[PDB]
Amino acid sequence: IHFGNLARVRHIITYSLSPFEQRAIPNIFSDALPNVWRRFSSQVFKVAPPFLGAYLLYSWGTQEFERLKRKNPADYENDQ
């Protein structure tokens, strides 16, 4: 029994309509997308950074590894 002993609530009215009197996915452009963007903006500068900062490290570490595999002509310049 969890429904009835949850909280002491007073004076809050709510209104809702049957699923059949309303649209499932409404106001896609007027409300939906604008918020998708909103949400996307609020976070990019929190998430993106360390992920981008990861990529770099990956790229560097990768390229450097390959570089150290290449030969340096300065080891054979005086091997007549």
């Binding site: 004076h11 009215i13 209104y15 809702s16 699923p19 590894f65």
Partner: protein, 241 residues
């Protein structure tokens, strides 16, 4: 680490997620294997019956297996003996044991080719590159007696001598047996030996997506439909203030 050359990406006719194997090319490949590779390479997991409905007719298959003698037994006296193959037999091993194999190939051991395109990074693209790609060693590099230089094989010194050369065999379908044609067909065949489900698997993937896209959309609408009750719900605080 160490230096290595990576094969390129050839546009195999079966690279497309929705693209199947060209069974004609596979059928050729089987010949290439049968008439060239099978000489040193074992293909333990494939059986003549496997060809039926894929590259050959039940009849051709029955024939192809009778071309071989297998070892059955024992008989009434407990002796072993020979008999002409049945479609239930698996492609004949070239050597009794690995020790014997190494012995006839300079201590090198030609690996069973049943899963080779999945046992090597690059699969066909690699196997194909390797085959056609033999050449002379660059300056400063010396290949020890018995090995052959191949830049595509790690270490570049491979125990396998170039196995295929122009017209080394004749496709009975009337296809110009240029060395690359061969490698190409055989590689195509190796793909198939490695995983016969290839075509069926992809045909299923198609069905899976279509249903998937259909079922997802539907359940999205249903999910939204139920939730709408909450999503639009409006409330207010009305104390007797």
């Amino acid at each position: 680490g160490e230096l290595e050359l990576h094969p390129p990406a050839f546009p195999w006719s079966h690279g497309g997620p929705l693209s199947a194997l060209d069974h004609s090319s596979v059928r050729r490949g089987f010949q290439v294997y049968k008439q060239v590779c099978s000489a040193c390479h074992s293909m333990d997991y494939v059986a003549f019956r496997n060809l039926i409905g894929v590259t050959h007719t039940e009849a051709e298959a029955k024939a192809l297996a009778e071309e071989v003698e297998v070892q059955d037994g024992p008989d009434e006296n407990g002796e072993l003996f020979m008999r002409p193959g049945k479609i239930s037999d698996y492609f004949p091993k070239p050597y009794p044991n690995p020790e014997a194999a190494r012995a006839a190939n300079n201590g090198a051991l030609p690996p069973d080719l049943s899963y080779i395109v999945n046992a090597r990074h690059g699969g066909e693209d690699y196997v194909f590159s390797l085959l056609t790609g033999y050449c002379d060693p660059p300056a400063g590099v010396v290949v020890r007696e018995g090995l052959h230089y191949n830049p595509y094989f790690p270490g570049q010194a491979i125990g396998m001598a170039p196995p295929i050369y122009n017209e080394i065999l004749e496709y009975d379908d009337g296809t110009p047996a240029t060395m690359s044609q061969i490698a190409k067909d055989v590689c195509t065949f190796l793909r198939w030996a490695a995983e016969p489900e290839h075509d069926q698997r992809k045909r299923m993937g198609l069905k899976m997506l279509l249903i998937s896209a259909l079922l997802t959309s539907l359940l999205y609408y249903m999910k939204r439909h139920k939730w709408s009750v909450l999503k639009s719900r409006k409330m207010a605080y009305r104390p007797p203030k």
